[PDB]
Amino acid sequence: MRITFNDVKTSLGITESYDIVNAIRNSQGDNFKSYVPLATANNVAEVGAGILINQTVQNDFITSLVDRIGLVVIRQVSLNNPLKKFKKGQIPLGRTIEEIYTDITKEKQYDAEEAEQKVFEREMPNVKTLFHERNRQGFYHQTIQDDSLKTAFVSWGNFESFVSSIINAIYNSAEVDEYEYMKLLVDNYYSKGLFTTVKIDEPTSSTGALTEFVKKMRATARKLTLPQGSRDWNSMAVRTRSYMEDLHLIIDADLEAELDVDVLAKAFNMNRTDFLGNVTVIDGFASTGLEAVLVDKDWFMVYDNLHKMETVRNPRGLYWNYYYHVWQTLSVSRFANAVAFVSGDVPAVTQVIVSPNIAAVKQGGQQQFTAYVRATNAKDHKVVWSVEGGSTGTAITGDGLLSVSGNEDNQLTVKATVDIGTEDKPKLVVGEAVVSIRP
Amino acid sequence: MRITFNDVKTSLGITESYDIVNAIRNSQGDNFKSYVPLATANNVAEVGAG
Amino acid sequence: TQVIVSPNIAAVKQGGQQQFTAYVRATNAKDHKVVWSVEGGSTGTAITGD
Amino acid sequence: DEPTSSTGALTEFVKKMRATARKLTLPQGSRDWNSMAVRTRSYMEDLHL
């Protein structure tokens, strides 16, 4: 079989901003006057950018002879992912990971007249759980047809180098895809509205506020590690604590350069104006608003289940097949602190969290729910509660107390909604919880 | 006693600013072009937050 | 500034298919839509929007 | 004025704080910084901000 091409131009997919040969020819004392004395300028400009598809060229002196190629160079590259340090061990058996967290309780006023009748009363501890599963199962497939590949080389060294490059491409692809999956984790988390958003663009004073972003980042990092804890920085609304040595700040190259040229080059004793967490620089995020993300070491929940490679030879077709199987689980923990720095515009409310998300009540019982809205601004918004159970008799008050009718058997859905849009154009942010009924 | 739950969504209390899977699918020169070649991206996006 | 088609040289049979990707060098942050065409001049040959 | 209004207000606040701290610990004492208006003296090591 012969594969041949005809009528191929040197300027195949080139869009010209301007014609350099015409500019040189038509220059009159312009910046192109330096190239006027050059004699073989058109020939250099015609083929100086390289050729995509080559064709046989006859020799200049003798038209019968053809021109040969005198050099062959093989280009090699090796890639790694910089986020591999956030991975955990392996899971050889099982599929699901369970994570449990016990929160804090409230203080009760001291009383003896009341205590004399409720000694054996019980108070349910507050505890939440979430689950992680294996979700990545892929393989990389390539083929090597060495007998058909022999004709493209005249040197065994070049042939072997090309085969080795083909082999290395598989591992390069695996590393690149792993990095992209890890970045997709953060982008998905931001897209689902589970971060706490801090604006780093609006300043508090028009007096040369070129340090507003670094001041905000420093303050946020400082208040992330207050000893008494807080429940404003995690998507499960649990009072937790962070440590300074376990905080990782993933930022952008342009942000790093901006900080370095703006504050570090002009600050005396720059230790008072640097970042606080462990800094890792990447090539930006996918979402519009993200500029930097500050997370905890326990935020990542990435494990690898399988890594293997297997080959098979086709003797009728005279070739080799390589398969590289990778199985992994990629997830994040909602119990860990995570904040995202935004330099654009954001909605008034990002999410609403109902603290009891799973409940089981009897036909005459009651359940109390609490709601936490994540408002970017300082404006306070009210929640409204509803129940989509269906039976008549079950009702929820405005505070968040749900009572269940004595005759009812179906799964109840408790919703708390907040309105942030205008009239006739409503926009709603909803938190939800599920209630089962004991018989 | 036997407490069970039936027909529970995987997006119980989640309100999304934008659909990440739709953004990846309908991408032409955007910042998701690196996510386009990913094979099992839908499952990771679906169960990546717990 | 330019648009680069990742496979620039291809060889296919009369019943085969090929996949091409386009990379657009955009100076600004705006997003632009690519449109594909074939100038072979034969009926029955087609290219999709993807 | 305000610690965050501008860069001059912050340094003015620093000046006022330093002056107050200096005059709270004069050896002769002062009945100017307590609710009982009694003449008392503080120490720099015991001052907390």
**Closest residue by Cα to residue A339 from A257, A238, A224:** A224
Residues of B in contact with C33 (CB under 8 A): 28
**Experimentally, how was this structure solved?**
cryo-EM
Q: Can you tell me the distance from the alpha carbon of A87 to that of A96, in angstroms, rounded to the nearest whole number?
A: 17
- Report the amino acid identity of residue D3: P
Phi, psi of A172 (to 5 degrees): -60, -45
Residues 6+ apart with CB under 8 A from A180: B34, B35, B38
Q: Can you tell me the distance from the alpha carbon of A182 to that of A291, in angstroms, rounded to the nearest whole number?
A: 17
Q: How many CB pairs under 8 A join A and C?
A: 17
- Report the amino acid identity of residue C19: Q
Q: Can you tell me the distance from the alpha carbon of B19 to that of A117, in angstroms, rounded to the nearest whole number?
A: 54
Q: Can you tell me the distance from the alpha carbon of B34 to that of A184, in angstroms, rounded to the nearest whole number?
A: 10
Cited resolution, angstroms: 3.0
**Closest residue by Cα to residue A418 from A433, A432, A434, A404:** A432
User: In the structure encoding, which two tokens stand for residue A75, read together?
Assistant: 């280009």
Sheet holding A412-419, edge to edge: A358-361, A428-437, A412-419, A384-387
* Chains contacting A (3+ CB pairs below 8 angstroms): B, C, D
Q: Can you tell me the distance from the alpha carbon of A143 to that of C37, in angstroms, rounded to the nearest whole number?
A: 31
Tell me how close the Cα of B10 comes to any Cα of chain A, in angstroms.
11
* Cβ-nearest to B50 among A130, A180, A433: A130
Answer yes or no: do A334 and B3 touch at CB < 8 A: no
Torsion of CA A388, B49, A326, A74, to 10 degrees: 130
Q: What is the 3-state secondary structure (H, E, C) of A230-284?
A: ECCCCCCCCCECCCHHHEEEEEEHHHHHHHHHHHHCCCCCHHHCCCCCEEEEECC
**Closest residue by Cα to residue B13 from A187, A193, A335, A96:** A193
**Closest residue by Cα to residue A232 from A198, A204, A189:** A198
Residues of A in contact with D1 (CB under 8 A): none
Residues of C in contact with B30 (CB under 8 A): 31
D to C contact (≥3 Cβ pairs closer than 8 Å): no
CB contact at 8 A, A59 and A53: no
User: In the structure encoding, which two tokens stand for residue C25, read together?
Assistant: 């060098």
User: In the structure encoding, which two tokens stand for residue A182, read together?
Assistant: 């890890």
CB contact at 8 A, A391 and A410: yes
Answer yes or no: do B20 and A285 touch at CB < 8 A: no
Identify the H or E element spanning D22: helix D7-24
Give the Å distances, CA to CA, from B11 to A312, A320, B15, B48. 42, 44, 8, 11
Farthest-apart Cα atoms in chain D, separation:
37
Q: Can you tell me the distance from the alpha carbon of A290 to that of A154, in angstroms, rounded to the nearest whole number?
A: 52
Torsion of CA A370, A100, A237, A290, to 10 degrees: -140
CB contact at 8 A, A273 and A267: yes
Residues of D in contact with A207 (CB under 8 A): 6-7
Q: Can you tell me the distance from the alpha carbon of C10 to that of A52, in angstroms, rounded to the nearest whole number?
A: 12
CB contact at 8 A, A98 and A131: yes
Question: If you measure CA to CA, which chain C residue comes closest to B33?
Answer: C23
Answer yes or no: do C32 and B30 touch at CB < 8 A: no
CB contact at 8 A, A395 and A366: no
C1 to chain A, any CB pair closer than 8 A? The answer is: yes
Tell me how close the Cα of C13 comes to any Cα of chain B, in angstroms.
25
- Report the amino acid identity of residue A371: A
| Mutation site for D-interface testing, chosen from A202, A206, A207 by largest number of D Cβ within 10 Å | A207
CB contact at 8 A, A196 and A339: yes
CB contact at 8 A, A371 and A396: no
Phi, psi of A128 (to 5 degrees): -130, 155
Tell me how close the Cα of A193 comes to any Cα of chain B, in angstroms.
6
